[PDB]
Amino acid sequence: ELVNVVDEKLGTAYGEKIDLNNTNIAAFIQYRGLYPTLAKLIVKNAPYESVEDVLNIPGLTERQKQILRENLEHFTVTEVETALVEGGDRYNNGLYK
Amino acid sequence: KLPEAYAIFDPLVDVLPVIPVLFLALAFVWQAAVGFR
Amino acid sequence: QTLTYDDIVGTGLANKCPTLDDTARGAYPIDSSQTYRIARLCLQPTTFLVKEEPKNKRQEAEFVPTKLVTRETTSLDQIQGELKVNSDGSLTFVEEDGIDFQPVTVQMAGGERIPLLFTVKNLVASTQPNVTSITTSTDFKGEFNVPSYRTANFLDPKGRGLASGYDSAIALPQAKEEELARANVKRFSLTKGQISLNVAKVDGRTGEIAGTFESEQLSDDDMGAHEPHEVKIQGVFYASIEPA
Amino acid sequence: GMFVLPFMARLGVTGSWSGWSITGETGIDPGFWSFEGVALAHIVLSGLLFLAACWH
Amino acid sequence: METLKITVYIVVTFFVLLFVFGFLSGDPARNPKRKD
Amino acid sequence: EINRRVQASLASGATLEEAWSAIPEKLAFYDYIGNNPAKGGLFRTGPMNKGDGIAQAWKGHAVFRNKEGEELFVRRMPAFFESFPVILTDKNGVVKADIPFRRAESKYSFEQQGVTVSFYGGELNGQTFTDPPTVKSYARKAIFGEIFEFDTETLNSDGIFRTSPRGW
Amino acid sequence: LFFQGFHNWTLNPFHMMGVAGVLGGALLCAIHGATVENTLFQDGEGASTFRAFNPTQAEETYSMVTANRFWSQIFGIAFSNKRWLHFFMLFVPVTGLWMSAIGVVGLALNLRSYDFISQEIRAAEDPEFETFYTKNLLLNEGIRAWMAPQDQPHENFVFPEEVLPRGNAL
Amino acid sequence: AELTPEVLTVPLNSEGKTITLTEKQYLEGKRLFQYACASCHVGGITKTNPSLDLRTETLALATPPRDNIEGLVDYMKNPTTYDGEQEIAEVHPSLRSADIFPKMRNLTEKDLVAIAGHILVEPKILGDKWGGGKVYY
Amino acid sequence: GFAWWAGNARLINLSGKLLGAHVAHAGLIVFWAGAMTLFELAHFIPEKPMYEQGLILIPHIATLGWGVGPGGEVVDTFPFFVVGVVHLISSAVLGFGGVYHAIRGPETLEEYSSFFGYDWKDKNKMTTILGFHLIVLGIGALLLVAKAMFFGGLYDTWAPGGGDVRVITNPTLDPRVIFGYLLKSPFGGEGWIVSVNNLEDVVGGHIWIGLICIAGGIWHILTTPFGWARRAFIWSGEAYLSYSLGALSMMGFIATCFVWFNNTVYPSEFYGPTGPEASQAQAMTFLIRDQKLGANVGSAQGPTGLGKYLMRSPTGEIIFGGETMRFWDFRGPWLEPLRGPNGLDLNKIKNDIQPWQERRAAEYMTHAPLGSLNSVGGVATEINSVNFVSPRSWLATSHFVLAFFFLVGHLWHAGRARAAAAGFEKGIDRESEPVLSMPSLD
């Protein structure tokens, strides 16, 4: 009844895709065209009901929409986990090299 | 770098700052010669 | 006229909110239409009260006073947010950003340290309906979030944590772990608090207001290690309003 | 099993420097003549008398 | 606290002046051999 | 030796359950670091039972598999180490799962690799666990070698290894 | 550094007695040499006082009496017996080294003073309890995990990034 | 093992053309990289933004691709963000910003090539250590 | 009576040979100033910050306003050359007087002229020599004032626009300010005279000290010591040397802290950032980096509950978070624009950080005064690559070492001087042992 919610989140798609609702912003560097600019937008406009909501971020250039489309299969959304989004941890989670 | 007309003495200058040290070494050569009197 | 850093530094006035002249008994009127922001909301606490635990049934222990031990580090400031007009004339302030948290530890009688995250994070505070003017009888009431005092990376003294750290008591390799689950599994608490803001001074010329606040919230639960205390915070506040 | 605590209480010493009193009231400043300060004073006294014993 | 601060200021100044004046009182002359 | 016996129980027909149930508990209990005399401490006094407890039963030999059905091996703690991390490997030595310290970039977590533990022989013979915290828990013990049930109450055992008469 | 991280050798009372013997010995060496050099008798006219000793002189070359009064008044106790003094100077560093040897014999068997059981039981139960003793074990734990693979190549330790113990940011 | 031509052979452009450095160029580039770059990029990391490193896989995924001599020489001329969207000459050493980054003032065109060369060869020699950080020291 | 290894003690009552010792040694000092400067210029490369280059003397010259313009950009190297040459040349003249007085001149001076001769025990002659040197020192301090006010100014790291040379037209004369420094606490946030943070106060204090030194120089020429001073001091050459060794030691400890903390008369442009400066620059750097990515740095709670980027000091000022909380007393020209009267202003941080501040912070963070003895820069676990130890680390450590031994030297000579004055420096008289005529303690 006492669960580590972070470990439990590694058993979800959070453990295999970039989770648009939870993943730190540094993960948007593993796919091209996404960092810093779209990463910044995705994070600020979170949370997302489903992966396809990213395309409804206002202000998107059609080039930006193309890159997001190109990468939707690398995204997921799970429920927001407080522990991963509090403390500005999506912008800086304590991990460098 | 030094002004060009002194270009010449560049390697003398790489050595000058150590000369004060030589004076301490020199005091021991003098005392060796006089028998540590 | 105002002061420079070098006048303030080391005095303790950096932890004090700006105050209003005792003459400032005005009113700031509200264009039902035009929009408004709070450009600066400052909350300075003056008193920390912790609820005791009464041990029996129908005694319900009291709010007892406490000694601060973390110094002039307590004030929330530079806060801002939307100030809306609802259909019925209630105003709602919606916090956006600011230095909206301070860790504090107060000491109860008998030595117990009680840490807490004095915060107004995500505050939404409303007025009664039919405002039309902010006056020296306007009250805001609202609620805010209180995240866990430590965030996820925090490592207890044995290296155990939630987003980092050991998942067991490594110094007790063959100990029975069920005794220790509460200490081994860290949990991230997220609770609500409540706050009243009582306007008592208004500069109708400048849009500045000031007064008193009381908030109630929970103390640190050390990532689930132990039960929290209830905390009541009293202090003073100041805010400036702008046509957005 | 407090033996000496009631003899301090009996003649007026009721609070501790940690802020509690035997009456149950929190937030009390007893000044020096708390349970702690009475104990201190007896240790200091004991030590002065020890030195007086050596002189004599 | 201010009572305490004043007291410590007094105690320290007292001891420091004992030191300054003690050494100003012909200290070189307090030796076993030769006194000035 | 233990593996020599299972290997030969199996070539000779027997099932996995049967090959391990054939392992005497006394031999399995030697294959446990808590009886290693080099695991004690100078001021950790008394009988070894005061530390890990009074051994009651062999629980069974624990077999870990990932989500691809690969059999994984817990790296055993060396005697030098008071603590040791939990790392699982394939028959070739490649890391395929572990218990991460930092979670945010972990890639080999039990949750991600879908690690399961099955038991052959002993008390837990023919039982499989899939819930991550349970699997991790036996993984934590498998670094000590074979897994035993202890009575910690009778002596109020504190859970810290002591040395043996050979050590003292 | 191996012995710190793996044996927690600083915590070992036999090492501590050794430290006290080596440092105690260095102290004795310095304090005795300085005392003789500043209780010297005036046995020559020159400002270099070394010239005024003769290896076959019978007379002590410094005053034990003045030395003793000095240290008695400065420290409270002093040596009065030259023989005991020089025996003590043999005794202190020899014993310290002997004590540390015993402790390393314990460590031949991993028989360490690694832990204090009472601290661990409290700290397992009480995540607010922290001492310099718990702080230093975290350091030992970092040491072991960070040096072990390159320091014990025969063990083929592969610690992936995610298993290394690390505090925040570093 | 030694510094062979196979290792000294790095992509020139994204077409796929290759270029083979000399040992001279390689040691030229290393020297220059220590002079102009190592203060932030020692070992292929970026001390002032650790999220972006000089591993070849990272450069390969930058916009425009930087895993080749051309992309890197261009970067030293007109650096951009990882997604290509903004020019960052104001805050990154570059020839375009040598008025404010004076170390770039004496870098000639072949110096740029040696530097870009060093960056592409070093991962082949050092492996994960390059851009890996202290974990691999 | 002295052995060869204490042979310079043989000069104590040979005023002529001892004059040569001092003047020859003064030539060694001027020689090194000259030679070292020319070595640094030979090796100087202008495109590289000075503090990447091992320079300790060029930075002292630039600081007086020579050879540099706005930003510490080196504009003209000739002043550096000139300073070296004139020093190097002048040391030959001092070398010459030195070997002459030490080997050929009169061993003792007092028979030649009664002006230059002295006896250590002549309290009047000694205060007169003291006074002449006080006036010289006073003159020197006014030389600095003259350069600042009449001959080009000084480099002012604080000058608006990134730093520049500036003439000082209004030196601080107010003694409440000048001597106020002398009474600030030496502890943190106060920092005694090390906190002087503007050139008006630096020039003004050198006016005071020049005048004070001239005044006192004339005082000591004109007076003889009073009786209370006669009876409290030891009057001997060794005793005077011991007094000066203590003063040198104290001064060396002050200079250590000066070069480690002060970024006004040791501009960071030339010497590298201070430890505190570099530490603040890292928090600035990631604050900038994270805010650009969208982080709200004011509301971001860090692991501990304290702000991840910003927190309060114990008196409430808004300050940089993390371990650098300890360095919030730091003030530097790249940072102060962000400061309001409650400390760091959140609205200036959000809106008004300039690229030159992002640049300066990145640079100072990567040039922190940490380095190995063999000049590998960075924390001690860093790999080889970057050849760098900050001039401030070299200057702080060298002078701490020197200051320490000079204190030992002071104790050594002061004790000896006492015992020599009372007549027991060579040991105890066996026939008159003081302790054997004293009562037993017990």
Ligand code: CLA
């Ligand atoms: C060769 C000697 C020897 C050995 C190897 C053993 C071995 C053992 N005994 Mg036995 N025992 C012995 C002698 C021995 N005993 C003697 C002589 C007695 C009577 C006193 C006993 C009485 C006894 C009892 C009552 C019990 C045991 C038990 C045990 C077991 C646990 C031991 C333990 O915790 O030690 C702990 C060891 C230490 C904490 C180390 C102590 C040594 C200190 C650190 C050295 C002192 C330092 C010194 C002051 C330094 C100064 C020097 C300098 C100033 C010059 C173990 C199998 C226990 C058990 O489990 O039995 C069922 C048990 O209960 N033993």
Ligand code: CLA
């Ligand atoms: C202003 C500085 C100053 C002055 C003028 C003097 C003057 C004197 N001292 Mg004092 N002294 C000083 C500072 C000073 N001292 C300091 C700072 C210390 C503490 C270390 C001492 C400690 C001291 C002692 C212990 C003694 C003196 C003595 C003396 C007298 C004889 C000294 C002699 O002949 O040395 C001769 C010089 C040498 C033998 C050479 C020493 C070389 C040093 C130790 C090596 C330094 C090398 C360097 C660090 C690196 C080398 C690099 C390599 C390439 C060579 C003379 C009156 C003697 C005395 O009391 O007589 C009255 C005596 O016994 N001094």
Ligand code: CLA
């Ligand atoms: C700054 C360093 C320094 C200085 C200035 C002096 C100066 C002096 N010493 Mg000391 N001394 C020193 C270091 C120093 N010493 C050290 C390190 C030691 C320990 C080894 C000693 C040990 C020592 C002893 C044991 C004695 C002295 C004595 C003397 C004095 C007489 C020397 C004499 O007649 O020699 C004559 C020497 C020569 C004729 C040889 C040639 C020396 C010349 C000067 C070399 C200079 C060359 C230079 C490059 C020329 C440039 C010329 C140009 C400027 C025109 C003289 C004032 C003596 C004294 O007090 O006499 C009463 C004495 O007995 N010294």
Ligand code: CLA
């Ligand atoms: C503080 C250092 C100092 C001191 C106290 C002395 C003291 C003395 N010297 Mg020595 N001398 C010195 C430095 C010093 N000299 C130097 C540096 C040199 C080499 C240039 C000499 C060369 C020298 C010689 C060759 C002779 C003496 C002689 C004498 C004696 C007679 C002086 C006299 O009447 O001259 C008359 C005075 C003057 C002409 C006034 C000179 C004014 C000077 C040039 C200007 C001073 C301004 C300023 C201080 C310099 C700084 C400028 C610079 C920073 C740019 C006297 C005891 C004589 C002696 O003892 O014979 C037995 C002798 O023959 N000296």
Ligand code: CLA
């Ligand atoms: C190189 C500097 C120097 C030296 C060595 C001397 C040496 C001397 N002076 Mg002169 N003096 C000087 C400069 C100097 N003076 C200057 C510039 C002036 C002008 C202001 C004077 C004015 C002066 C007067 C008016 C008198 C002397 C006197 C004396 C003699 C007694 C000194 C004494 O007891 O001090 C020891 C000092 C004390 C016992 C009290 C000082 C307490 C201070 C405040 C302690 C502070 C130390 C602290 C750690 C550092 C921080 C500083 C603080 C202010 C913040 C002595 C020969 C006396 C004498 O006999 O003259 C004929 C005398 O009456 N001096």
Ligand SMILES: CC1=C(/C=C/C(C)=C/C=C/C(C)=C/C=C/C=C(C)/C=C/C=C(C)/C=C/C2=C(C)CCCC2(C)C)C(C)(C)CCC1
């Ligand atoms: C320049 C400058 C300035 C100024 C300065 C000044 C003005 C200073 C002063 C200083 C001073 C003003 C000092 C003083 C000093 C003093 C001392 C240091 C003392 C000492 C003493 C002693 C040593 C004594 C002792 C004794 C005793 C106690 C008893 C008896 C015996 C005897 C006598 C021994 C400023 C900062 C503004 C800025 C920058 C620049």
